[PDB]
Each structure stands twice: as structure tokens, then as C-alpha cells.
Scaffold this active site. Sequence first.
Site, PDB file in Angstrom:
ATOM      1  N   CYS A   1       0.835  -1.148   0.168  1.00 22.68           N
ATOM      2  CA  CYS A   1      -0.097  -0.083   0.002  1.00 22.68           C
ATOM      3  C   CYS A   1       1.213   1.408  -0.369  1.00 22.68           C
ATOM      4  O   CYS A   1       1.129   1.932   0.426  1.00 22.68           O
ATOM      5  CB  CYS A   1      -1.412  -0.223   1.287  1.00 22.68           C
ATOM      6  SG  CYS A   1      -1.948   1.777   1.446  1.00 22.68           S
ATOM      7  N   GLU A  24      -5.288   3.772 -10.698  1.00 28.83           N
ATOM      8  CA  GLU A  24      -6.028   2.209 -10.504  1.00 28.83           C
ATOM      9  C   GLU A  24      -7.266   1.921 -11.551  1.00 28.83           C
ATOM     10  O   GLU A  24      -7.301   0.898 -11.708  1.00 28.83           O
ATOM     11  CB  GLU A  24      -6.806   1.634  -8.815  1.00 28.83           C
ATOM     12  CG  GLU A  24      -5.177   2.172  -7.559  1.00 28.83           C
ATOM     13  CD  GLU A  24      -5.549   2.474  -6.261  1.00 28.83           C
ATOM     14  OE1 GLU A  24      -6.170   1.108  -5.909  1.00 28.83           O
ATOM     15  OE2 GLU A  24      -5.989   2.850  -5.636  1.00 28.83           O
ATOM     16  N   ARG A  51       0.129   4.489   2.931  1.00 27.64           N
ATOM     17  CA  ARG A  51      -0.137   4.421   4.036  1.00 27.64           C
ATOM     18  C   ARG A  51       0.329   5.625   4.773  1.00 27.64           C
ATOM     19  O   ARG A  51      -0.331   5.313   6.590  1.00 27.64           O
ATOM     20  CB  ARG A  51       0.743   3.133   4.706  1.00 27.64           C
ATOM     21  CG  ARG A  51       0.190   2.091   4.333  1.00 27.64           C
ATOM     22  CD  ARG A  51       1.509   0.630   4.827  1.00 27.64           C
ATOM     23  NE  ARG A  51       2.771   0.586   3.508  1.00 27.64           N
ATOM     24  CZ  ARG A  51       4.279   0.062   3.737  1.00 27.64           C
ATOM     25  NH1 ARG A  51       4.397  -0.545   4.996  1.00 27.64           N
ATOM     26  NH2 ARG A  51       4.635   0.103   2.210  1.00 27.64           N
ATOM     27  N   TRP A 103      -9.969   5.567  -0.403  1.00 26.42           N
ATOM     28  CA  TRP A 103      -9.714   6.752  -1.669  1.00 26.42           C
ATOM     29  C   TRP A 103      -9.070   6.223  -2.837  1.00 26.42           C
ATOM     30  O   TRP A 103      -7.838   4.812  -2.302  1.00 26.42           O
ATOM     31  CB  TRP A 103      -9.797   8.371  -1.410  1.00 26.42           C
ATOM     32  CG  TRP A 103      -8.872   8.388  -0.859  1.00 26.42           C
ATOM     33  CD1 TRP A 103      -7.274   8.740  -2.048  1.00 26.42           C
ATOM     34  CD2 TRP A 103      -8.142   8.985   0.310  1.00 26.42           C
ATOM     35  NE1 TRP A 103      -6.271   9.472  -1.051  1.00 26.42           N
ATOM     36  CE2 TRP A 103      -7.098   9.377   0.281  1.00 26.42           C
ATOM     37  CE3 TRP A 103      -8.924   9.152   1.167  1.00 26.42           C
ATOM     38  CZ2 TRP A 103      -6.439  10.383   1.227  1.00 26.42           C
ATOM     39  CZ3 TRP A 103      -8.230  10.017   2.476  1.00 26.42           C
ATOM     40  CH2 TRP A 103      -6.549  10.340   2.700  1.00 26.42           C
TER      41      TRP A 103
HETATM   42  C1  HEM Z   1      -6.835   6.245   1.950  1.00 27.05           C
HETATM   43  C2  HEM Z   1      -6.306   6.006   0.135  1.00 27.05           C
HETATM   44  C3  HEM Z   1      -5.476   4.675   0.106  1.00 27.05           C
HETATM   45  C4  HEM Z   1      -4.861   4.731  -1.260  1.00 27.05           C
HETATM   46  C5  HEM Z   1      -4.720   5.629  -2.494  1.00 27.05           C
HETATM   47  C6  HEM Z   1      -4.464   3.674  -0.614  1.00 27.05           C
HETATM   48  C7  HEM Z   1      -3.314   2.957  -2.553  1.00 27.05           C
HETATM   49  C8  HEM Z   1      -3.443   1.726  -2.738  1.00 27.05           C
HETATM   50  C9  HEM Z   1      -2.748   1.079  -3.916  1.00 27.05           C
HETATM   51  C10 HEM Z   1      -2.382   2.351  -5.193  1.00 27.05           C
HETATM   52  C11 HEM Z   1      -2.481  -0.068  -3.597  1.00 27.05           C
HETATM   53  C12 HEM Z   1      -2.090  -1.410  -4.223  1.00 27.05           C
HETATM   54  C13 HEM Z   1      -3.539  -2.005  -5.352  1.00 27.05           C
HETATM   55  C14 HEM Z   1      -3.577  -2.410  -6.452  1.00 27.05           C
HETATM   56  O1  HEM Z   1      -3.022  -2.461  -7.111  1.00 27.05           O
HETATM   57  O2  HEM Z   1      -4.483  -3.420  -7.166  1.00 27.05           O
HETATM   58  C15 HEM Z   1      -3.270  -0.190  -2.176  1.00 27.05           C
HETATM   59  C16 HEM Z   1      -3.041  -1.446  -2.272  1.00 27.05           C
HETATM   60  C17 HEM Z   1      -3.990  -2.298  -0.529  1.00 27.05           C
HETATM   61  N1  HEM Z   1      -3.855  -0.599   0.224  1.00 27.05           N
HETATM   62 FE1  HEM Z   1      -3.896   0.510   0.248  1.00 27.05          FE
HETATM   63  N2  HEM Z   1      -5.006   2.983  -0.297  1.00 27.05           N
HETATM   64  C18 HEM Z   1      -5.403   3.390   0.427  1.00 27.05           C
HETATM   65  C19 HEM Z   1      -5.924   3.234   1.851  1.00 27.05           C
HETATM   66  C20 HEM Z   1      -5.835   1.997   2.478  1.00 27.05           C
HETATM   67  C21 HEM Z   1      -6.703   1.294   3.729  1.00 27.05           C
HETATM   68  C22 HEM Z   1      -7.991   2.446   4.693  1.00 27.05           C
HETATM   69  C23 HEM Z   1      -6.022  -0.012   4.089  1.00 27.05           C
HETATM   70  C24 HEM Z   1      -6.451  -0.986   4.912  1.00 27.05           C
HETATM   71  C25 HEM Z   1      -7.202  -0.335   6.054  1.00 27.05           C
HETATM   72  C26 HEM Z   1      -5.649  -0.196   2.444  1.00 27.05           C
HETATM   73  C27 HEM Z   1      -4.802  -1.531   2.698  1.00 27.05           C
HETATM   74  C28 HEM Z   1      -4.048  -1.577   1.438  1.00 27.05           C
HETATM   75  C29 HEM Z   1      -3.832  -3.317   1.243  1.00 27.05           C
HETATM   76  C30 HEM Z   1      -4.086  -4.193   2.101  1.00 27.05           C
HETATM   77  C31 HEM Z   1      -3.572  -3.586  -0.088  1.00 27.05           C
HETATM   78  C32 HEM Z   1      -2.750  -4.903  -1.098  1.00 27.05           C
HETATM   79  C33 HEM Z   1      -3.767  -5.396  -1.254  1.00 27.05           C
HETATM   80  C34 HEM Z   1      -3.976  -6.839  -2.013  1.00 27.05           C
HETATM   81  O3  HEM Z   1      -2.953  -7.313  -2.150  1.00 27.05           O
HETATM   82  O4  HEM Z   1      -5.006  -6.811  -2.594  1.00 27.05           O
HETATM   83  N3  HEM Z   1      -4.869   0.770   2.275  1.00 27.05           N
HETATM   84  N4  HEM Z   1      -3.922   0.560  -1.575  1.00 27.05           N
HETATM   85  C1  LIG Z   2      -8.306   0.033   0.820  1.00 22.19           C
HETATM   86  C2  LIG Z   2      -7.535   0.288  -1.032  1.00 22.19           C
HETATM   87  C3  LIG Z   2      -7.961   1.940  -1.233  1.00 22.19           C
HETATM   88  C4  LIG Z   2      -7.346   1.416  -2.621  1.00 22.19           C
HETATM   89  N1  LIG Z   2      -7.242   2.870  -2.919  1.00 22.19           N
HETATM   90  N2  LIG Z   2      -7.331   0.831  -3.194  1.00 22.19           N
HETATM   91  C5  LIG Z   2      -7.341  -0.885  -3.269  1.00 22.19           C
HETATM   92  C6  LIG Z   2      -6.957  -1.548  -3.386  1.00 22.19           C
HETATM   93  O1  LIG Z   2      -7.043  -2.657  -3.862  1.00 22.19           O
HETATM   94  C7  LIG Z   2      -7.688  -3.713  -5.259  1.00 22.19           C
HETATM   95  C8  LIG Z   2      -6.853  -5.533  -4.935  1.00 22.19           C
HETATM   96  C9  LIG Z   2      -7.955  -5.981  -6.097  1.00 22.19           C
HETATM   97  C10 LIG Z   2      -6.931  -7.030  -5.861  1.00 22.19           C
HETATM   98  O2  LIG Z   2      -6.449  -7.950  -5.447  1.00 22.19           O
HETATM   99  C11 LIG Z   2      -5.724  -8.439  -5.886  1.00 22.19           C
HETATM  100  C12 LIG Z   2      -5.543 -10.022  -4.781  1.00 22.19           C
HETATM  101  C13 LIG Z   2      -5.886 -11.436  -5.252  1.00 22.19           C
HETATM  102  C14 LIG Z   2      -5.010 -11.866  -4.220  1.00 22.19           C
HETATM  103  C15 LIG Z   2      -5.105 -13.537  -4.777  1.00 22.19           C
HETATM  104  C16 LIG Z   2      -4.280 -11.897  -3.485  1.00 22.19           C
HETATM  105  C17 LIG Z   2      -4.077 -10.691  -3.402  1.00 22.19           C
HETATM  106  N3  LIG Z   2      -3.315 -10.341  -1.756  1.00 22.19           N
HETATM  107  N4  LIG Z   2      -4.453  -9.183  -3.827  1.00 22.19           N
HETATM  108  C18 LIG Z   2      -5.714  -6.307  -6.073  1.00 22.19           C
HETATM  109  N5  LIG Z   2      -5.729  -5.238  -5.264  1.00 22.19           N
HETATM  110  C19 LIG Z   2      -7.455  -1.006  -1.847  1.00 22.19           C
HETATM  111 CL   LIG Z   3     -10.254  -1.501  -7.501  1.00 23.31          CL
END
Ligand code: HEM
Ligand SMILES: Cc1cc(N)nc(COC[C@H]2C[C@H](OCc3cc(C)cc(N)n3)CN2)c1
Ligand SMILES: [Cl-]
Lengths: 362, 362
Positions: free
Chosen positions: B65, B242, B68, B237
Amino acid sequence: EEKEILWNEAKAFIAACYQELGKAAEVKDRLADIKSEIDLTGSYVHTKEELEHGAKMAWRNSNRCIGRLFWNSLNVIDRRDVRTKEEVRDALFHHIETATNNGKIRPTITIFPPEEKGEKQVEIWNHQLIRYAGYESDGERIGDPASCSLTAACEELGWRGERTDFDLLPLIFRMKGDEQPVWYELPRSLVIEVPITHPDIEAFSDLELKWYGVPIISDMKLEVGGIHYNAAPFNGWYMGTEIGARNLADEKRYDKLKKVASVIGIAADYNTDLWKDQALVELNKAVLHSYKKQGVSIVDHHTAASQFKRFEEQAEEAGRKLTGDWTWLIPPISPAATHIFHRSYDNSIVKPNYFYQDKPYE
Amino acid sequence: EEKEILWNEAKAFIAACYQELGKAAEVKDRLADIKSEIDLTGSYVHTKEELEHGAKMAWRNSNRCIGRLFWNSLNVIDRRDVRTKEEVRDALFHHIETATNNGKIRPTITIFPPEEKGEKQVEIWNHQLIRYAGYESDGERIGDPASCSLTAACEELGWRGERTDFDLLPLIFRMKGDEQPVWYELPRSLVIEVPITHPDIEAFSDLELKWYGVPIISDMKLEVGGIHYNAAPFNGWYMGTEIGARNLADEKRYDKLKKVASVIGIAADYNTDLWKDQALVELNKAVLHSYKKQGVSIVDHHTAASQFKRFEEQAEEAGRKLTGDWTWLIPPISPAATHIFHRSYDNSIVKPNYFYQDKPYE
Ligand code: HEM
Ligand SMILES: Cc1cc(N)nc(COC[C@H]2C[C@H](OCc3cc(C)cc(N)n3)CN2)c1
Ligand SMILES: [Cl-]
Ligand code: HEM
Ligand SMILES: Cc1cc(N)nc(COC[C@H]2C[C@H](OCc3cc(C)cc(N)n3)CN2)c1
Ligand SMILES: C[C@H](O)[C@H](O)[C@H]1CNc2nc(N)[nH]c(=O)c2N1
Ligand SMILES: C[C@H](O)[C@H](O)[C@H]1CNc2nc(N)[nH]c(=O)c2N1
Ligand SMILES: [Cl-]
């Protein structure tokens, strides 16, 4: 220990090399010949065929290289015979001329005598045979900041650059037995350069940007079957992003994005306008257009990634494990528009390969 | 073994959590209280304070993320009290409303009762609370291909979508003790959507693109001190890329680049024209412009990376190791224009954290 590391690497390389060349039956006696030679001399000499195929395997194993599809057509020049600095100089001049090939670039490596006791026979100081000087004194930057330390080393030895933003650095190298390296000015007739223009935007020429045609890396060691060829410069043709998205764009390089934004008529004030991204795209279009217009080989990152897909497919059908460094293979613009972005790669090191080595200055 | 893994994770979490909250003196008795509770009940219950700070630590430890920086202002909603599907439904409706906040998005997580014997109390089927349906039958694709399997699962249970390219999927979840999940249509009044227009190019509206305002991930497990909250949807947000560089652009998603190229008046015929890169940039400019115009929170990748730099600096000054996944942190357009590209990150997993879990369909 050294002799044992050598012998083990020899064994592994000769087996794989000869297997690939359909010469598996000859492995036994060749190995025996090598073992005796190491016992007597402390090392062994590659056949022309082993050396050529080794250089090719090394390219094939280069995890960071997207251009590996063409590994088997590497033009290998065997210069293990050189003994004098005049012969080294002339060999480097020749590499430049034959690799450039009037703009139809030939991927080429020139291989010089290898290290002995870890003792280099020829120590090349340049990072690339053709590169621009860099200067900085009193906060004004001139030329390529990546070249500042080498440039200062050359000038300490009596070279002087004209202090344009594109001074060609001299060839600089040291021979075994000499305390000081020697340097030679690059004949301009040997160096192709491309002025950067844009296909639609006439004003782009106002930036007066250019770049050199041929990247010829001369600071890496080629390792083949335990033999260390520290001096073995090699080249391909550029992928456009190397010039457009990095050399000309990085803040620590030529840092041209603000100037690009201005000539393409967009403001450089708001992150949300994505002006850097837009400038990057137009600069990269200009680089590709300019090289094509001049008839100098270049590849765009989309085509390059498609070629690499085929390298992957070719590896699988030959039964060879694929290795790669995802962090270097993705292009620095629109990476997610390539297949590379969406898969993973095993970053294991496989030899023969090319390796970074310490520079004498620095 | 299970109880021992639990007790060990409890110990580690309570110490770190209370240290951070200046409550280090209370660790001893709290731990003793927990140890007894695990002996009796097989588990332990978090205080409101532990749960809130744990959710925040989890965000702070999310290697992938870029957003953060704002970890400590996560709005944590404690719904461990829910027992009925009506209460689950209403809690999800509430999360949508309060997180959306008329477009001034509040990063929020709603936490439901945790697993017991590995036995879920509430099992949410949606990947995000708000997402578009996907269909494919006879080679014609409608909507979001990433949603095809979930969509088919909903329709098998009697839901039917209108088969536009943007059908809102219903909320779908299962309660402990029920064999079938239940589903509820999303009230449109609850879901903010943004039509995509371009700041300069009037024709962009012809593509009739839109996206939803708030990404609310509902398929990850929050782990805090050995307690597994499998149902704990959270949102931020969007970062513009994305939507613009992936959701609307990926060939396996909405695949809009050719249509974008056409409305912006460029040919989509030659890799060397970098039409994909150019389309990607204009589409991404449009996404940012459209969200801003509607007063819905969004961040561009440059600003986001600058915020992340500050997260790094804040970590160092608090004496906390930084972890990150470089492969996810770099943005998918102009990655080398961010500081992230030029450094490396330790990808170690630190808990509390959010983890993927298996979905029931699929
Ligand atoms: C406030 C605005 C936020 C922005 C702009 C942001 C941005 C992002 C982005 C760009 C990614 C990569 C996602 C992708 O390529 O699919 C991401 C992943 C992630 N974010 Fe954030 N995020 C935000 C808030 C949060 C919050 C509030 C949480 C949890 C409390 C969080 C937890 C995560 C997690 C767990 C991932 C990894 C998801 C995965 O493995 O698929 N984020 N974030
Ligand atoms: C909280 C939050 C904020 C923000 N701006 N963007 C996000 C993006 O999370 C979207 C989620 C949807 C896909 O999930 C794919 C995925 C698949 C698997 C098998 C594992 C994994 N960790 N992640 C990639 N990240 C999440
Ligand atoms: Cl999305
Ligand atoms: C024929 C055209 C070629 C293209 C288009 C190409 C493309 C590239 C690119 C884009 C990189 C990443 C460079 C960077 O970001 O700094 C690279 C790295 C590399 N290429 Fe190639 N390459 C080509 C030929 C060759 C040849 C002929 C060799 C060796 C025989 C080679 C060996 C390597 C090595 C060792 C690296 C890693 C360099 C490092 O670690 O700094 N490539 N290549
Ligand atoms: C042969 C070739 C063809 C082509 N199109 N492009 C290249 C690019 O290679 C340029 C070289 C210059 C920097 O070298 C940096 C570097 C530094 C260090 C300490 C180690 C290392 N492996 N690499 C990055 N790659 C090489
Ligand atoms: C895992 C594989 O390398 C894949 O392409 C990753 C790469 N980096 C990514 N980065 C982000 N932000 N989101 C993703 O979905 C992916 N996918
Ligand atoms: C090592 C560090 O992640 C650094 O930014 C790398 C990333 N990927 C790269 N990829 C290429 N092609 N060239 C580079 O110089 C770098 N630098
Ligand atoms: Cl270069």
C-alpha cells in the site's frame, strides 16, 4: 580453493556448452585436457568455439536484459591476442565501427585477454565506450552527471573537455605493468549521434537534444567456465525508453522534463495534470522517431516486450529454465501494458553471465 | 499448537500495542488476563482500544500500500456485536454511507465477529462492497471480466443483472449455520459514481465511461494478535492509476485503450507511435479531472508517492523498520518519475496485517 572453483566451473560449462553444440561425445577428453592444463599452468584456454558460445550463453543468462531473444546471433570478436595499448585502442575503435555498421547496429562483443591471478591484463576505465562527460563546480551542472567522477579522472590525466552538454569522453584504459592508464580522443567520424526531433511538434528541436547511437557497455566482467574476462565490451541497440525515460529525463541525469513540457505547450504546475507523464510520452515518441528517421537501429518497449515473450517461449521449448529480474525487465513507461508486468520471474543467477566489477577511480 | 500460536501472537501484539499507546505498565496484567482467558475459552477478546490500534497497525504494515501515511487516522467501526444477517446488511450499508461521506472519503474499516475454530461467523462473498458485474456467453463480453465467477454465483442464487457494462453487484454473504448465503440489492442512493470526461477533449464523453467512488475491499482477513477477523471490509480513496491504467485499461478488464486512442484522435496501428502510452496518459488525466470535478476524493500517483516518502521518513523517526513490496508500490504509469522506483524495500511480513483468504465460490 581457487583451482578447485575453477575446475568445477570448467566441468559445468564444458558439459552444458558441448551438449548445446551437439558435441557431447567430446566432453570427456576435453575435460581431461583441461584438468591437466590447470595442474600445469593454474588455468586453461578456451577454444574459439567455447568462447563464442560462452559469450552467447552469458547474454542468454542476463536476468536484467529484455533483448535476449537475439542471444544466438551475438557477433563475437576474439582479441585474446592483444598485448599492446595500441592494439587495445585499435580494437576498441574497430568494435565501435563494426557494431555501428552505418546505423544498422550489430550486437557485438570484443573479448580481451582474461585475468590471471585476479590480475587484469587490460583494465578499461570507461563505463561505455561512447558516453558524454559531466561537470559540476559552483552549482552549475554541464553534461551528464553520471559521468562526473570519470570525467574528473580523465582531466586529472591531462584530457580537457570543451564543456558542452555532450562532450565525448576519451577512451581510457590501463595495461598490466603500467601505473597510469592512457587515454585517446574518440574520432568523431566513428561516433553516430541522433538529433532529437518530434514528428509533429516543430519546436521540439529548440531543446537541442541529441544522443549517441550505440550503447557499448565496457565495465562488466564476462565469466565463462571459471575464466574471468574483465575486459569484454559488448553492445546492442537501444530500447527507446533508456534514452527518453531515463538518460534524458531522470532528475539526476539530463533532467529535461520541464523543458519538454514547455515546448509541447503544457503547464508544469500541477501533479494532477500528469504533465510529467505527458512530457515523458512525447519525449519518448521523439526519440523513436528520430532514430528511425536517421536509419539508426532502436526498438520501442512494446515491440521489445513482444520479442521477450518469444524468448520465454523459446526457452521453454528448448527445456531451459528461464531466469529474469522483473524489476529491470518492466519498461519505465506503461509497464502494465506489457505482458512482463503481469507475470513473475525467477531471479536466480546462472553462469556464464556478465557481472559488475569495481572501478579504479571511485 | 493452535493455543500456543495464539498465546505467542497475543504476547507480541499486546507488548508492541501498549508500548505505542504509552501503556507499557499495563502489559503484565493484561497478558495474565489473556492467558487465563485462553485456558478457559480457547481464545481472547480485544479491548476497543486494542482492536482500533491493531487495525491501524495492520494498515501500517501493508507492504503493497502506497497510501500508508494516513494509517493513524483510520476510522475503526467495532461491529463484533452483530448476530443477524439484517445487522450485517445494515452495517455494510452504513460503512458505504459513512466512508463515502458525500464524496469526502473517510478511510474506514468495519470489524465483524472473528473466526472461532477457524469457523467464520460471517463470510462475505464480495471482493469489494461496490463492484460491477461481468458476463460472458458466446464470445460477447459485458461488464467487468474480473467479476464473472462471482456474478455467476449470484445469478445462480436468483439475482439477475440488467447486463449493462456497469451493473452493481448485490451484497452477498453467508452466516454461520446457514448453508446458503443471502444477497441484497445495493440502494443506488448509497453509491456515488463518477462519469469520466476529459478536461480538453469534448468527445471523451462519447466513450460513456464511469467508475464508482469508493473501493471497499471485503475479501481480506484482518489478523491482530492471533485473532482472525475474516470479515472486516476496509476502504480508502482511489489513486487515479488504479482506475485509469488498470481497471479501464487492462485487456482482461474493460480494455478501453483502442477506443481512447480513437476519441483523442490518434492512430492505434504502430507500436513506435506509443499510442497506448499516450492513450493511457489522457485516460488517466480524465479520471483525475472527473473525480475532482465531482468533489470525490482521489489522489494522483505523484502526490501519493510524495506522501509515501513522508511515511518512510515518519517510520525512521519513530524507530520502526519500514517494509514494502516494490513491485506493487511503483505506479503503473511513469514509475521512474517517483522516488519509489529508485530505492529498494524490505518485503518482510509484519503483523498485525491484512491477508488474502480463499473464496467459497472459485
Ligand atoms: C486512503 C487512500 C488509500 C490509497 C490511495 C491506497 C492506495 C493503494 C494502492 C494503489 C494499492 C495497490 C492496489 C492494486 O494495485 O490493486 C493499495 C493496496 C493495498 N492497500 Fe491501500 N490505499 C489507501 C487506503 C488503504 C486502507 C485504509 C487500507 C486498510 C486499512 C489499505 C490497505 C491496502 C492493502 C491491504 C493493499 C494490498 C491489497 C492486495 O494485496 O490486493 N489501504 N493501496
Ligand atoms: C483499501 C484500498 C484502497 C485503494 N485505493 N486501493 C485498493 C486496491 O485494492 C484492490 C485489490 C484488488 C486486487 O486483489 C488481488 C489479490 C489477489 C490475491 C489472490 C491476493 C492478493 N493479495 N490480492 C488487487 N488489490 C484498496
Ligand atoms: Cl479497484
Ligand atoms: C540488441 C539489443 C539490446 C537491447 C534492446 C537490450 C535491452 C536492454 C535493456 C533495456 C536493459 C536494461 C538497462 C538499464 O535499465 O540500464 C538491458 C540490460 C542488460 N543487457 Fe541488454 N539489450 C540488448 C543487447 C544486449 C547484449 C548484446 C548484451 C550482452 C552480450 C546485453 C546484456 C545486458 C546486460 C548484462 C544488462 C544488465 C546491465 C546492468 O546490470 O547494468 N544486452 N538490456
Ligand atoms: C548491451 C546493452 C544494450 C542496451 N540497449 N542497453 C544496455 C543498458 O546498460 C546500461 C547499464 C548502465 C547502468 O549500469 C548500472 C549498474 C551499476 C552497478 C553497480 C551494477 C550493475 N549491474 N549495473 C545500468 N545498465 C546495455
Ligand atoms: C505479481 C505480478 O508481478 C503482478 O503483475 C503484480 C505486479 N505489480 C502490481 N502492482 C499493483 N499496484 N497492482 C497489481 O495488481 C500488481 N500486479
Ligand atoms: C534497484 C532499484 O530498484 C532501481 O530503481 C532499479 C529498478 N529497475 C530498473 N530497471 C531498469 N531497466 N534500469 C534501472 O536502472 C533500474 N533501477
Ligand atoms: Cl545508456
